[PDB]
PDB file of C-alpha atoms and ligand atoms in Angstrom:
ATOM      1  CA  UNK A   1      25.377 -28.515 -95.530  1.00  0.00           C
ATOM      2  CA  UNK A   2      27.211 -30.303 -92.555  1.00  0.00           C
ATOM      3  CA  UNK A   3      24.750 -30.931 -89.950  1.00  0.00           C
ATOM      4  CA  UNK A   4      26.652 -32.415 -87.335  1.00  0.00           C
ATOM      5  CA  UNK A   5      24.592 -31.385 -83.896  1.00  0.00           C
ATOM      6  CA  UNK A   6      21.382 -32.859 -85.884  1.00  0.00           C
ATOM      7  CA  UNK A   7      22.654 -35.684 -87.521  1.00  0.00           C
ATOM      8  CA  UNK A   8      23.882 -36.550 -83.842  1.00  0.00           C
ATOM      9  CA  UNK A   9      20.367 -36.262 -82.394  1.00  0.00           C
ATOM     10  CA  UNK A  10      19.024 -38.001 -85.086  1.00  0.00           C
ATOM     11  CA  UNK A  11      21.519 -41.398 -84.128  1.00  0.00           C
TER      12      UNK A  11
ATOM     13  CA  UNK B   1     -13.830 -47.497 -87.723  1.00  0.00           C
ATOM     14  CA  UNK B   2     -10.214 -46.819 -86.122  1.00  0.00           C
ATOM     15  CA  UNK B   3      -8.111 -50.507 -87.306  1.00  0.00           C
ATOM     16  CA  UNK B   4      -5.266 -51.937 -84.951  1.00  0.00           C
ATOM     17  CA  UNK B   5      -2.517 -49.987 -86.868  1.00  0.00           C
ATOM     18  CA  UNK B   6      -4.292 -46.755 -86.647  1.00  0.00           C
ATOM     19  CA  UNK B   7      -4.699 -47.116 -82.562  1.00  0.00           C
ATOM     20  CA  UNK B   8      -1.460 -48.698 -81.979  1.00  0.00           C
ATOM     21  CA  UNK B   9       0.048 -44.437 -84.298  1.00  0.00           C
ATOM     22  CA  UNK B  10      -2.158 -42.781 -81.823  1.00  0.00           C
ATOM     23  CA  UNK B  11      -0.533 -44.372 -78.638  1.00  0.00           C
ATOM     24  CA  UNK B  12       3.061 -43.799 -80.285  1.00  0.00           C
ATOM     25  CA  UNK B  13       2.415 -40.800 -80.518  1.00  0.00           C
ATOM     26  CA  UNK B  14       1.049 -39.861 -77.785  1.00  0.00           C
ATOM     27  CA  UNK B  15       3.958 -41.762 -75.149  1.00  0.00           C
ATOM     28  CA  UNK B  16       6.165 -39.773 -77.846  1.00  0.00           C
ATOM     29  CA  UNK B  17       4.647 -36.437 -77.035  1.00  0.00           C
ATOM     30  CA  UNK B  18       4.875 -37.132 -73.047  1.00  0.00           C
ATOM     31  CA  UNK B  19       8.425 -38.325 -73.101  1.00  0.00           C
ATOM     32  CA  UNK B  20       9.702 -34.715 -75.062  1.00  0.00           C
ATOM     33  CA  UNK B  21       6.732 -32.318 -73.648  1.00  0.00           C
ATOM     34  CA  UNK B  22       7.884 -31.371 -69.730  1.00  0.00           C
ATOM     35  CA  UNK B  23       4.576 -29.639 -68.809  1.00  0.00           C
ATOM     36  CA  UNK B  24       6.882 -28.620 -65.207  1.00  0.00           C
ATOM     37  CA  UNK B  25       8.660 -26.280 -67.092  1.00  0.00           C
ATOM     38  CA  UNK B  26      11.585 -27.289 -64.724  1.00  0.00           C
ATOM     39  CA  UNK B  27      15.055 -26.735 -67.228  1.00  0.00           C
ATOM     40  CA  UNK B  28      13.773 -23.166 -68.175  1.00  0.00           C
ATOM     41  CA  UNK B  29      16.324 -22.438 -65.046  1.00  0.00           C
ATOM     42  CA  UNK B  30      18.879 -23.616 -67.768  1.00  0.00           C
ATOM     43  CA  UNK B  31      18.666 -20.940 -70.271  1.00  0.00           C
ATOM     44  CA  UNK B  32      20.488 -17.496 -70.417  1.00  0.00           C
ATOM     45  CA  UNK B  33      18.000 -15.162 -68.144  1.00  0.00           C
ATOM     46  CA  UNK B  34      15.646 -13.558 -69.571  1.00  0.00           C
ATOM     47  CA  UNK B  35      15.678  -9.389 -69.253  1.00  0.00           C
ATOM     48  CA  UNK B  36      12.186  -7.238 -69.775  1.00  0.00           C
ATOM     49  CA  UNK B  37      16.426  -0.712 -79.202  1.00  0.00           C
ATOM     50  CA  UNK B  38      17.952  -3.168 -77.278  1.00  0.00           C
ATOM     51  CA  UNK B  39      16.938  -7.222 -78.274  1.00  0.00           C
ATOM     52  CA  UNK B  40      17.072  -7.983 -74.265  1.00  0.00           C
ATOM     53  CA  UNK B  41      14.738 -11.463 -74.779  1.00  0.00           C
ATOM     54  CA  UNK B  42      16.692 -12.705 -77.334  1.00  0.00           C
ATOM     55  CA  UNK B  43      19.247 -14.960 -75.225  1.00  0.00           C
ATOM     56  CA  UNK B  44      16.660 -16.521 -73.114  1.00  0.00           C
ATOM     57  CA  UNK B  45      14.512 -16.900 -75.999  1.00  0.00           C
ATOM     58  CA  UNK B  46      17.279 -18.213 -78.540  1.00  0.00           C
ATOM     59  CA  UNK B  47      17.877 -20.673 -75.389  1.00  0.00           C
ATOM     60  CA  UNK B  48      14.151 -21.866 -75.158  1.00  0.00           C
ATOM     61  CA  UNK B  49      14.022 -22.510 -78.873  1.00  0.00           C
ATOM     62  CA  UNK B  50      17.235 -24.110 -79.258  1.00  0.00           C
ATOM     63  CA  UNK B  51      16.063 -26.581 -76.600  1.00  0.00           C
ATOM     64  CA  UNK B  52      12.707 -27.106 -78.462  1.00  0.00           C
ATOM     65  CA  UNK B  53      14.437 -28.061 -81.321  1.00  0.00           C
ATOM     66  CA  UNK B  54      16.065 -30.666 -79.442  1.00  0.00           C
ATOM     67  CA  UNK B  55      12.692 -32.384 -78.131  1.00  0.00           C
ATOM     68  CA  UNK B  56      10.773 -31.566 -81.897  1.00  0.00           C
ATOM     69  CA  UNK B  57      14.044 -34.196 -82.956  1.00  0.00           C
ATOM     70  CA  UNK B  58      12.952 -36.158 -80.199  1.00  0.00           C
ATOM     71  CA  UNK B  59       9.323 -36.539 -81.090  1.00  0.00           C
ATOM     72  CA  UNK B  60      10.080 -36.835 -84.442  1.00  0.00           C
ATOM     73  CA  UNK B  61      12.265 -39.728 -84.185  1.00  0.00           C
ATOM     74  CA  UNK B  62       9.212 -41.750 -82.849  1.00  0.00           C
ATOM     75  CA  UNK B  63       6.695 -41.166 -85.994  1.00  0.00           C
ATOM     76  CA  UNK B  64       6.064 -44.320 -87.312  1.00  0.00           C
ATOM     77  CA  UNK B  65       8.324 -44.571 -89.896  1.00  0.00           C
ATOM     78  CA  UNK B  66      10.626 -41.719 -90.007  1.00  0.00           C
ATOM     79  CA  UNK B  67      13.418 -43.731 -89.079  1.00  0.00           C
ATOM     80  CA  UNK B  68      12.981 -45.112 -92.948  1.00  0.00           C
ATOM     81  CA  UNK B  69      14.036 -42.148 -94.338  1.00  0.00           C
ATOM     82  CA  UNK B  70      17.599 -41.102 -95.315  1.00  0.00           C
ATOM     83  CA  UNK B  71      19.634 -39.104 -92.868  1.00  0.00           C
ATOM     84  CA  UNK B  72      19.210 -36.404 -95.977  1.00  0.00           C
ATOM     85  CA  UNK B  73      15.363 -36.814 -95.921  1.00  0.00           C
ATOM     86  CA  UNK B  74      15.376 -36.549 -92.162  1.00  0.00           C
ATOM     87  CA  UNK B  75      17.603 -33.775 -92.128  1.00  0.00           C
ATOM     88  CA  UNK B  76      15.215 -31.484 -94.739  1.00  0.00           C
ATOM     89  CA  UNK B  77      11.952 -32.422 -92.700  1.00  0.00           C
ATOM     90  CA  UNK B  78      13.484 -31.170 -89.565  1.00  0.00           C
ATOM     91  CA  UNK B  79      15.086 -27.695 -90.460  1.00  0.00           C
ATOM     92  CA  UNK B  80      12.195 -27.116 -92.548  1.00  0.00           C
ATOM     93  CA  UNK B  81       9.440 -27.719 -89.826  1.00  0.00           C
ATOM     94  CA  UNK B  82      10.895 -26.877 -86.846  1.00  0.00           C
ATOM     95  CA  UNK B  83       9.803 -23.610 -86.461  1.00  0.00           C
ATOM     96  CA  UNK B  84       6.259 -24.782 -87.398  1.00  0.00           C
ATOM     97  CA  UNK B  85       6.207 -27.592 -84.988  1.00  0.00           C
ATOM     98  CA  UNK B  86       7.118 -24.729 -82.035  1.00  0.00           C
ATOM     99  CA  UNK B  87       4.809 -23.215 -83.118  1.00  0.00           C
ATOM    100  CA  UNK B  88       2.178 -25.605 -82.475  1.00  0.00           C
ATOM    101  CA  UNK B  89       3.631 -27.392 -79.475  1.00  0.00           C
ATOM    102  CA  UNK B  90       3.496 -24.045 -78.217  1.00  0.00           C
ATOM    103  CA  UNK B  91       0.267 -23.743 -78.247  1.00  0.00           C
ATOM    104  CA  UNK B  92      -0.433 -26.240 -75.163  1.00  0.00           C
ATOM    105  CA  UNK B  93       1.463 -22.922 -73.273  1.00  0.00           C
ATOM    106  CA  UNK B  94      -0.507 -20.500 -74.545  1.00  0.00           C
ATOM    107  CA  UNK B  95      -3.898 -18.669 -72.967  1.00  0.00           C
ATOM    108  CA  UNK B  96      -6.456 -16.571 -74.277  1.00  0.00           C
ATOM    109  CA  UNK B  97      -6.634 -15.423 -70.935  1.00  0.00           C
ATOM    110  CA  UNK B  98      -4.160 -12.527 -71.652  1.00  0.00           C
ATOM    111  CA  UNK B  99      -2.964 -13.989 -74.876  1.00  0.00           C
ATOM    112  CA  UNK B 100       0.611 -14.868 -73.823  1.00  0.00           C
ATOM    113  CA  UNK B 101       2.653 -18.481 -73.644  1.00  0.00           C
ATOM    114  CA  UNK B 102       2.610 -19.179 -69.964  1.00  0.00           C
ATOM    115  CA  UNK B 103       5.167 -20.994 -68.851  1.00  0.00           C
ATOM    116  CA  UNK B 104       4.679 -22.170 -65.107  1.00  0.00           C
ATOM    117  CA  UNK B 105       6.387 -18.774 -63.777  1.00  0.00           C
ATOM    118  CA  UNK B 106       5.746 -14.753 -64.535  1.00  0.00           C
ATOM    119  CA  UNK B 107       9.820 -14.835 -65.295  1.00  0.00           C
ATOM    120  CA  UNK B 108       8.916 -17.679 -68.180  1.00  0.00           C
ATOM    121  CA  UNK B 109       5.524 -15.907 -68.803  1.00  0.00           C
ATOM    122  CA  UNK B 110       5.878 -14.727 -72.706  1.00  0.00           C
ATOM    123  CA  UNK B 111       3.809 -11.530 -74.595  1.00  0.00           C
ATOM    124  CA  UNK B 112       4.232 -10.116 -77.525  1.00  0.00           C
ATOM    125  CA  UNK B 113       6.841  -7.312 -76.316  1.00  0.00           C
ATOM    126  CA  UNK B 114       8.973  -9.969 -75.444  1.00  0.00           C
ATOM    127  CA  UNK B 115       8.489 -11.559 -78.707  1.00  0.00           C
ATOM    128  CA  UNK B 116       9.544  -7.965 -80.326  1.00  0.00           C
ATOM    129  CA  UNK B 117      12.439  -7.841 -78.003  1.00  0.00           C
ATOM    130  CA  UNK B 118      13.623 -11.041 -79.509  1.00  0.00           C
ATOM    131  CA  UNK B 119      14.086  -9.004 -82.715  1.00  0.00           C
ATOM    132  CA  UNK B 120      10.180 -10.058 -84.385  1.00  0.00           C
ATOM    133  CA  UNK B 121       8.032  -7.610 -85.794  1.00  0.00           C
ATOM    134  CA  UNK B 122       4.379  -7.372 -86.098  1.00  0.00           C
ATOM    135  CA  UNK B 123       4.170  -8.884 -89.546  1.00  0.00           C
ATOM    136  CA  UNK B 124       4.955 -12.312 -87.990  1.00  0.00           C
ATOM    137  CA  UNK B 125       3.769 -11.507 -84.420  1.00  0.00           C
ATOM    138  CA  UNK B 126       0.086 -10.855 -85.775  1.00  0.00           C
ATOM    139  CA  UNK B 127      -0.900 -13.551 -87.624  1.00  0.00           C
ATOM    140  CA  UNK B 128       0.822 -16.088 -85.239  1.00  0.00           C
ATOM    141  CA  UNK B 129      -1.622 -14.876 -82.439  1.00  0.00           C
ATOM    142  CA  UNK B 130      -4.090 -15.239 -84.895  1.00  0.00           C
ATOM    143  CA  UNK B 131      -2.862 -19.081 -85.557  1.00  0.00           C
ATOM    144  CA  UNK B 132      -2.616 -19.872 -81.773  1.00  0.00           C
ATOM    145  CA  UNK B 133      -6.263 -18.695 -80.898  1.00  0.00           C
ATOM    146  CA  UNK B 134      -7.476 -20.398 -83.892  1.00  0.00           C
ATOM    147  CA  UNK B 135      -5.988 -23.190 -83.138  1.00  0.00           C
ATOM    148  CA  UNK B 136      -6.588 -23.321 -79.030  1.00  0.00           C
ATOM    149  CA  UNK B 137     -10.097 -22.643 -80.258  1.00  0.00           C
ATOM    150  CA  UNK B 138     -10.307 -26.419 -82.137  1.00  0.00           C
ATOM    151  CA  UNK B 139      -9.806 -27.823 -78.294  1.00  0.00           C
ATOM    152  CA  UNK B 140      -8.293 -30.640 -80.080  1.00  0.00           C
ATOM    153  CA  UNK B 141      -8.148 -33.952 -78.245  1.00  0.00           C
ATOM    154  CA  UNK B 142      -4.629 -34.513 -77.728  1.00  0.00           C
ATOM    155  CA  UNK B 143      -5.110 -37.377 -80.055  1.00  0.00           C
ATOM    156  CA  UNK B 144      -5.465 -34.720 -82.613  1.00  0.00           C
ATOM    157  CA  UNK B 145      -2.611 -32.577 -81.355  1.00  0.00           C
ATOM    158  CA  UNK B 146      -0.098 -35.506 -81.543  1.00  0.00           C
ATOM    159  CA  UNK B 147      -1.281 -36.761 -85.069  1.00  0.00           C
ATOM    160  CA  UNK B 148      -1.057 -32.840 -86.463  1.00  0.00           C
ATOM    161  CA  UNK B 149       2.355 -32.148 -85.261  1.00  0.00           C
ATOM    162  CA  UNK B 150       3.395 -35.565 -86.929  1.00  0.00           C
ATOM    163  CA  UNK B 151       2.092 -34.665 -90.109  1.00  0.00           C
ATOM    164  CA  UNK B 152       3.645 -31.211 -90.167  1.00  0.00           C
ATOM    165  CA  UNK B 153       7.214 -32.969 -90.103  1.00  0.00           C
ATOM    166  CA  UNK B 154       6.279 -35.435 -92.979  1.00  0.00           C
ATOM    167  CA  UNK B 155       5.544 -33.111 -95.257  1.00  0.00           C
ATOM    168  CA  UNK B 156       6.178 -34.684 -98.663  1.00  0.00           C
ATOM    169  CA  UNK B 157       6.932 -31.197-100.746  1.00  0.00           C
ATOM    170  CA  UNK B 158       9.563 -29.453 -98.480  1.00  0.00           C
ATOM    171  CA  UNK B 159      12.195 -28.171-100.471  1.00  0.00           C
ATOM    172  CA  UNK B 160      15.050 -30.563-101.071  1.00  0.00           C
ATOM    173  CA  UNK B 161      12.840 -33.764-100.528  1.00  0.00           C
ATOM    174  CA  UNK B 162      14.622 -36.760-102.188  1.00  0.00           C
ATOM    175  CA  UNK B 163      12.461 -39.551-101.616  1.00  0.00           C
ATOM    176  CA  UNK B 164       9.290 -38.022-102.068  1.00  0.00           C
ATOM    177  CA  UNK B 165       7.067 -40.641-102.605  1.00  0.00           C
ATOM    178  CA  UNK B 166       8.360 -42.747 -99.140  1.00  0.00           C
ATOM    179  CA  UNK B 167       7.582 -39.628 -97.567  1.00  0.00           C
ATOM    180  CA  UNK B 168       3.975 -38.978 -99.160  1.00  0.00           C
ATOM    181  CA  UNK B 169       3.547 -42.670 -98.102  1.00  0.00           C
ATOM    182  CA  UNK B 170       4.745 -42.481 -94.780  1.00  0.00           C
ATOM    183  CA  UNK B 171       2.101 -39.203 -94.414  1.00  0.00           C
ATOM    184  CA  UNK B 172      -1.073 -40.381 -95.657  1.00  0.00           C
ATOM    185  CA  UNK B 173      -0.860 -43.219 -93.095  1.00  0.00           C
ATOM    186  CA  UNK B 174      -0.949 -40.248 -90.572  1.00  0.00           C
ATOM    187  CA  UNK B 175      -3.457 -38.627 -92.580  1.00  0.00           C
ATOM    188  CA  UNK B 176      -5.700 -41.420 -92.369  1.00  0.00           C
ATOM    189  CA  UNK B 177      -5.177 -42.159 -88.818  1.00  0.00           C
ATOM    190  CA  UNK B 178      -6.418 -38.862 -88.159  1.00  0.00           C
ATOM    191  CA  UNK B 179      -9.335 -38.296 -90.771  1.00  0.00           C
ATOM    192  CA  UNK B 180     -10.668 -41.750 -88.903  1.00  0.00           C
ATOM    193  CA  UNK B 181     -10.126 -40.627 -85.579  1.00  0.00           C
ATOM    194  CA  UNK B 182     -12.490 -37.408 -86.143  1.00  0.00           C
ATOM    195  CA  UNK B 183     -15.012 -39.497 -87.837  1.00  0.00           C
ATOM    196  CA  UNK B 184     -15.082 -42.256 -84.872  1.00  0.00           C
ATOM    197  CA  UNK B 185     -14.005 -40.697 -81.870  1.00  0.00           C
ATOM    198  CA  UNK B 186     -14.468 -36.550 -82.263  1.00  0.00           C
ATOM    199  CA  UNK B 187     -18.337 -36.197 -81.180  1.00  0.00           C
ATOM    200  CA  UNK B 188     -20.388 -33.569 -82.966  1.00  0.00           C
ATOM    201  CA  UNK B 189     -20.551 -30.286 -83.337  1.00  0.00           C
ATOM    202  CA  UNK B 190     -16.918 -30.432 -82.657  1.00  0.00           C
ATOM    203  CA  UNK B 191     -15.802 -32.529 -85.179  1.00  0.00           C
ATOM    204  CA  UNK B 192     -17.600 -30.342 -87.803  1.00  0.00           C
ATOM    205  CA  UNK B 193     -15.322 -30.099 -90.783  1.00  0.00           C
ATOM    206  CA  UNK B 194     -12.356 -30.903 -88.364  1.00  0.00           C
ATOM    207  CA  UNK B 195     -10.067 -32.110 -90.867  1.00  0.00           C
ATOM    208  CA  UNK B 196     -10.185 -29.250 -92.915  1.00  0.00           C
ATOM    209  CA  UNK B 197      -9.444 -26.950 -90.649  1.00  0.00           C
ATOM    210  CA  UNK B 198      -6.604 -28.955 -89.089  1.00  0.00           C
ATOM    211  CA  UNK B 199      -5.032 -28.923 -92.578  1.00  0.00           C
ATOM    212  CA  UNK B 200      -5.562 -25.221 -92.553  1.00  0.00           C
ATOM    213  CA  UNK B 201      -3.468 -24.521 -90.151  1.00  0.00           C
ATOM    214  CA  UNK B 202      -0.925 -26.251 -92.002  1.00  0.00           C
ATOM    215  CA  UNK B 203      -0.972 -23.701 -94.412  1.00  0.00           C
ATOM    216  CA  UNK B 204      -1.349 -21.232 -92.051  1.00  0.00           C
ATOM    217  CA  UNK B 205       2.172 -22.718 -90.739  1.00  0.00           C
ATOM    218  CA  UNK B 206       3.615 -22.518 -93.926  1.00  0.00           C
ATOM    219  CA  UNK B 207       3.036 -18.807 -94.314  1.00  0.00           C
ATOM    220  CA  UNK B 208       4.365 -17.744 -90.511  1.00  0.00           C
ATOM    221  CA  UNK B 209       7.444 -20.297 -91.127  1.00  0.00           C
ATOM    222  CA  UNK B 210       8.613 -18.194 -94.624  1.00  0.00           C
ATOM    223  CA  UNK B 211       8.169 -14.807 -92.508  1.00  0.00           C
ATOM    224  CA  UNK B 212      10.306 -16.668 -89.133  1.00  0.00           C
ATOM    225  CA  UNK B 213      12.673 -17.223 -92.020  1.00  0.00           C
ATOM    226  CA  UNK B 214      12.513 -13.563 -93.580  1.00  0.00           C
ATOM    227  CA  UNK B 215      12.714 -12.057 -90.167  1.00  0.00           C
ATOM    228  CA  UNK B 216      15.509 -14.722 -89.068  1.00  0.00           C
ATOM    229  CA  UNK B 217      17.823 -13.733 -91.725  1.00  0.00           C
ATOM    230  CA  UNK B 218      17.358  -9.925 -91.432  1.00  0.00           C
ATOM    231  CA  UNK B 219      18.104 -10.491 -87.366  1.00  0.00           C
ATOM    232  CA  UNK B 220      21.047 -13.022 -87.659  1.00  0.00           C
ATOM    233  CA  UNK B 221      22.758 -11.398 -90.672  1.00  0.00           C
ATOM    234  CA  UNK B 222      23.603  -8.745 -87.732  1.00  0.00           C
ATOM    235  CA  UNK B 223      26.795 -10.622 -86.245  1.00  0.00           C
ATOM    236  CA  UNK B 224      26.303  -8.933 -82.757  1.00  0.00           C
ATOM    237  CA  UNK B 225      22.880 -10.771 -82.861  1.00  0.00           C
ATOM    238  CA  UNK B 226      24.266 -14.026 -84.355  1.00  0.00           C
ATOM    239  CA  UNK B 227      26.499 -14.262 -81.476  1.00  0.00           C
ATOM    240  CA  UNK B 228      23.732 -14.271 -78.718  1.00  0.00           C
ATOM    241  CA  UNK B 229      22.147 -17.330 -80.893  1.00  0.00           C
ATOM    242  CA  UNK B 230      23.053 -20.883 -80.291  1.00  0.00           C
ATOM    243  CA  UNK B 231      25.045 -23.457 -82.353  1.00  0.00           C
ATOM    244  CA  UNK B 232      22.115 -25.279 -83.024  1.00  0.00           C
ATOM    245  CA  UNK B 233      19.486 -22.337 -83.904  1.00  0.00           C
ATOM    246  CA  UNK B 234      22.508 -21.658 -86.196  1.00  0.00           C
ATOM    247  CA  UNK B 235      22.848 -25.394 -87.709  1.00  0.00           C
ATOM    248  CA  UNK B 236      19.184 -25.329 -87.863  1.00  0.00           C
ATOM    249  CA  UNK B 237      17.901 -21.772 -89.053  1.00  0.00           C
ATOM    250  CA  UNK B 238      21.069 -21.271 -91.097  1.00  0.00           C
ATOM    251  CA  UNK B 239      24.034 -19.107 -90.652  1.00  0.00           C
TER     252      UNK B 239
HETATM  253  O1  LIG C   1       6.505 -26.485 -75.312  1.00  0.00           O
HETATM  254  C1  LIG C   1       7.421 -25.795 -74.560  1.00  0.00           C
HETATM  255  C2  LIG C   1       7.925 -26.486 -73.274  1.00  0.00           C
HETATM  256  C3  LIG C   1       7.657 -28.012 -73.357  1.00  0.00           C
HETATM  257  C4  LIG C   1       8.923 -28.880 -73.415  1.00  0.00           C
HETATM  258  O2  LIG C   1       9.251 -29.503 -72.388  1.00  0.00           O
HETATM  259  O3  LIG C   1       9.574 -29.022 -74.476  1.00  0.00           O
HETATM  260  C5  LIG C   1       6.858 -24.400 -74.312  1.00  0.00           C
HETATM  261  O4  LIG C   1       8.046 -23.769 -74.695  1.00  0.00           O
HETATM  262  C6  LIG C   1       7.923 -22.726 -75.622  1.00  0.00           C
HETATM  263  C7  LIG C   1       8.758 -22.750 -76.686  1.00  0.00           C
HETATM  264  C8  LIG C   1       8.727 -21.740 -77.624  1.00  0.00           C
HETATM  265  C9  LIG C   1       7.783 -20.677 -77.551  1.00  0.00           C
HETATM  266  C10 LIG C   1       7.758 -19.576 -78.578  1.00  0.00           C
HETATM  267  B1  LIG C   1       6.246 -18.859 -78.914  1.00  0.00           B
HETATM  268  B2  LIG C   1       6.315 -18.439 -80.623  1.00  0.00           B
HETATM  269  B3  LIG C   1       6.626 -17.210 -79.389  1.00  0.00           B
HETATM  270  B4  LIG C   1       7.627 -17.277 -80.835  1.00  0.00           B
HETATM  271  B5  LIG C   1       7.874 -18.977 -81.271  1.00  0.00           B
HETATM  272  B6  LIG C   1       7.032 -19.962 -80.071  1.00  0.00           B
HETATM  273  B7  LIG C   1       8.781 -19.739 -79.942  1.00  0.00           B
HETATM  274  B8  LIG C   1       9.082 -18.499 -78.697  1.00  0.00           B
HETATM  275  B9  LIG C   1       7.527 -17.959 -78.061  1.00  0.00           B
HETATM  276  B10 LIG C   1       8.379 -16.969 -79.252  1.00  0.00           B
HETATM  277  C11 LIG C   1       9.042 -18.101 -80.352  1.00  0.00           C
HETATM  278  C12 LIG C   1      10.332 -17.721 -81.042  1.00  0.00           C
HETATM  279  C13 LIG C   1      11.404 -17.217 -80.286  1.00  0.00           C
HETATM  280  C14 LIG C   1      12.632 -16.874 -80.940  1.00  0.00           C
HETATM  281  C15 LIG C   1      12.758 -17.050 -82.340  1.00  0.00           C
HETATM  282  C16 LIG C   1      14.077 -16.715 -83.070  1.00  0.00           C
HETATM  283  O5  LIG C   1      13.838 -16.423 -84.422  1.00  0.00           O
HETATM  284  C17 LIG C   1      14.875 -15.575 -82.380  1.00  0.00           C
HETATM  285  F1  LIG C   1      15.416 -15.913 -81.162  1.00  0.00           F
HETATM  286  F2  LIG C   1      14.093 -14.486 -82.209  1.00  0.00           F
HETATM  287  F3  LIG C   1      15.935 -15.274 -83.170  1.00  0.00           F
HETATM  288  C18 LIG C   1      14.922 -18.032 -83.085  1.00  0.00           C
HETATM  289  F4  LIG C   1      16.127 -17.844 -83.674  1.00  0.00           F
HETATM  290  F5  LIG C   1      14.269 -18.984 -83.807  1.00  0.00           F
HETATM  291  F6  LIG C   1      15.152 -18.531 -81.832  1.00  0.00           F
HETATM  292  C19 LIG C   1      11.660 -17.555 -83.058  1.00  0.00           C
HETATM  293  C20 LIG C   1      10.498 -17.880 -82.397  1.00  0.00           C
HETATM  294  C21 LIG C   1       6.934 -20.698 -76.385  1.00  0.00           C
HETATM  295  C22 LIG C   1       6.978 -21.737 -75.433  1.00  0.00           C
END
């Protein structure tokens, strides 16, 4: 549940 | 009668769409080539999808008032529509000419062998033709088009949906924007029971994202096909 690469898009 | 608010969505949108929607086709040159029971589409295709996700994230990030949400909310409403919102940004590509996503270029030109030699079978490839020529036959204005792809990413009963409500709230302003756009700017016979069947292909979505997924997890669970995905069609679809 770590989402880094979207989290980064997201801001 | 279309209020302030409701025009001022509709232009958001639609500078939104333009800024992540590259009608040149220009980065295709980007991805791994593509090659026409061997999966010999699935690099270039994996590519092209993993860099659709990345302008979906971009569109999304200008709805009017996704940037309320959590980073958790966000995070759901993305991995859950993605493949949806492909789907229907895909559809601008698309021709019922030969019934293929053209992409500027015969190399970028995509049928449904190539779809199959991405690892898809006929029980999504079917009904997702079915979808695009039902939905290339609503000629929506791309008003419409903007307003439906925004309302596909905030859905309120995704799975793992915290906040609900905000979400619900954040969607019938969308909602409305569009059921008043039909009614004041989609002349007849065209705007016959519009709405309706805009929200049918909603659920038409719904039903071609669960078999993406099924299919998805029956290709990726293959390692050797895992490693021709990307990090982010991993991060996204799952791993
Ligand atoms: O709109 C843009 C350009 C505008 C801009 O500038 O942004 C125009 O581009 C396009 C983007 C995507 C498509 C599609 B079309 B439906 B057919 B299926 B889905 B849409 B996606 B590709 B073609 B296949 C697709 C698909 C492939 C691979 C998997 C897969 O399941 C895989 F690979 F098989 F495993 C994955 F994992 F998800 F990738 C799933 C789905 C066409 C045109």
């Amino acid at each position: 549940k770590n989402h880094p690469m979207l989290m980064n898009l997201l801001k | 009668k279309l209020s302030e608010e409701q025009q001022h969505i509709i232009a958001i949108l639609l500078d939104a769409h333009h800024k992540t929607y590259d009608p040149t086709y220009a980065d295709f040159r980007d991805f791994r080539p593509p090659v026409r029971s061997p999966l010999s589409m699935l690099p270039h295709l994996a590519d092209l999808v993993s860099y659709s996700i990345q302008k979906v994230i971009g569109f999304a990030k200008m709805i009017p008032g996704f940037r309320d949400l959590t980073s958790d909310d966000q995070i759901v409403l993305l991995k859950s529509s993605a493949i949806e919102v492909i789907m229907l940004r895909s559809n601008q590509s698309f021709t019922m000419d030969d019934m293929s996503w053209d992409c500027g270029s015969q190399d970028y030109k995509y049928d449904v062998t190539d779809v199959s030699k991405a690892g898809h079978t006929l029980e999504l490839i079917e009904p997702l033709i079915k979808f695009q020529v039902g939905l290339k036959k609503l000629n929506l204005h791309e008003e419409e088009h903007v307003l439906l792809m925004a309302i596909c990413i905030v859905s309120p009963d995704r799975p793992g949906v915290q906040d609900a409500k905000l979400v619900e709230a954040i969607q019938d302003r969308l909602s409305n924007t569009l059921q008043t756009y039909i009614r004041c700017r989609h002349p007849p016979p065209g705007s016959h029971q519009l709405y309706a069947k805009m929200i049918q292909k909603l659920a038409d979505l719904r039903s071609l994202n669960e078999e993406h997924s099924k299919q998805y997890r029956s290709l990726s669970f293959q390692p050797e096909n895992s490693m021709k995905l990307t990090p982010l069609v991993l991060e996204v679809f799952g791993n």
